[PDB]
Symmetry: D2
């Protein structure tokens, strides 16, 4: 199995304050489960080849998704911003598979990704433990 | 908009103890969001015609999903038990739409549903506020 | 160290739904901390001879406290019901020490305790692991 | 009633990640309760003249407390760092009253306070709504 444990850092009150509004797990690799402990979020997966998505909403209405997973035994991540209300995590997570429009991002196996949204919010995912089965990453909103 | 607020009642320690491992929102009706407050869980939706699923896992390994939504201006619900690890909420939620195998259950517009699983766990969903836009239901594991 | 992990079972929607409104840790035995994981609550203490209290409020307005700790290397518990708003856990926890009015209950070192409040709500604390340093109990509201 | 709603911002992963390990409510002004909603924390009090404390622990072992309250109809705040394990929030909260050693900080009725701990962690409490009965503050760790 693989696990990915996320710590969420929100840096800048001017961007508003984000909370989780959805959590999905893709069905490959015998699926997986999200759990929470001590304010952290862990995705546990049945092997290499699947992923999960957290969707966040800010108190200013901004919607963004963070995807993490393991592809061919290496971690990957992506952040999608500027989402419409109908673009739920249930819509987004499958887009990384079955030759969907985001598959290329999964294939990159990124240990770090940075993107800034249409309303100016800075997002970074950065793995702090980048190899092995017990992976760790910081999700930073700025 | 419609909201459905759930209170989870776990009755019987012999069944183990369940926690939420996934939360999905279907993309119809401009989507929606899950939120938590005072130990309760609220699905807020952009109109009639969509839904969301909570997947639960017990500390004895049992996996079950609870689906709630609004179909043609009336609440509906379903509970699916005996799930395999690969049958995530991401798999289950869409099965209520696009002529999927669970669409019939949504169409019933049930205000109450009772089912007992293969390992003997009793599940009930019961709406306590059954009409209007601010719906309320108890989810009982027994 | 000693830890006590609690699982909260709520049986009867007629009593309303309870959530935690305060958590205290008494200062003996190098204190301790509350943490949450997978819907469970763990009090971790620096040794035998201290305790902590969760105060709960129901959505029907009922206030009650659950105390757990270790006294002379054996677990103990208590439940206090019918609290007034000013009787916070900060008031209650110290009453088990310094010859306070609740010390007698700590001294009993109970592995189980049952009480019914004046409004008819049944409360039970029952330890399912009653010996050693990694203690476990169910807290049952009914 | 007075309420104080807190949003917690953590800026700098180098300081580690903090989670709440205790929440107290002082017994004056008919007490009060802590609640959580959408990742925010609200202290609801029966009137002016009381307070509550959140104690946080980082995953690097640092212990700190944040006190908020209303004194003579104006908000107040304080932060105490470098705590030993036995200095729980149960010890700290009462120190703001009965001519205790921290009363002077309550009496200042501060809308903002900044402190850096001996290990280099910056803490700020800043009220964003500083008047009326529905007060709001950001708690920033850096
Ligand atoms: C080893 C690995 O990461 N493989 C990835 C695939 O994962 C496998 O997918 C199959 C279903 O096709 C099955 O669920 C396996 O258990 C799982 O390991 C899959 O994610 C593909 C997607 O393009 O990438 C890798 O091949
Ligand atoms: C009024 C209502 O509940 N209608 C249901 C449909 O919901 C609509 O679906 C469309 C997309 O087809 C769109 O998203 C609308 O905003 C939404 O109201 C849909 O759920 C169907 C599924 O069979 O049932 C009703 O017709
Ligand atoms: C071993 C044990 O449980 N002792 C209990 C006491 O606990 C000790 O208390 C002292 C403070 O007086 C100190 O904090 C120690 O670290 C702690 O172990 C205490 O709880 C008394 C209360 O009457 O009961 C036992 O003796
Ligand atoms: C109006 C106000 O904020 N008064 C503060 C006091 O609060 C009152 O305290 C008494 C108990 O002595 C009682 O609990 C009241 O209900 C409460 O309003 C108290 O906090 C003092 C502490 O020095 O400060 C103000 O006077």
């Amino acid at each position: 199995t693989y696990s990915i444990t996320l710590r969420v850092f929100q840096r800048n009150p001017g961007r508003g304050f984000f909370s989780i509004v959805e959590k999905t797990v893709f069905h490959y690799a015998n699926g997986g489960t999200w759990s929470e402990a001590k304010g952290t979020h862990t995705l546990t997966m049945g092997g290499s080849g699947t992923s999960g998505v957290l969707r966040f909403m800010s108190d200013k209405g901004e919607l963004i998704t963070v995807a993490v997973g393991v592809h061919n035994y290496k971690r990957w991540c992506d952040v999608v911003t500027g989402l419409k209300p109908e673009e739920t995590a249930l819509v987004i997570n499958p887009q990384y598979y079955n030759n969907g429009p985001r598959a290329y991002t999964r294939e990159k196996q990124l240990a770090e990704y940075n993107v800034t949204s249409v309303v100016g919010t800075r997002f970074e995912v950065k793995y702090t433990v980048v190899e092995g089965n017990n992976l760790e990453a910081n999700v930073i909103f700025s």
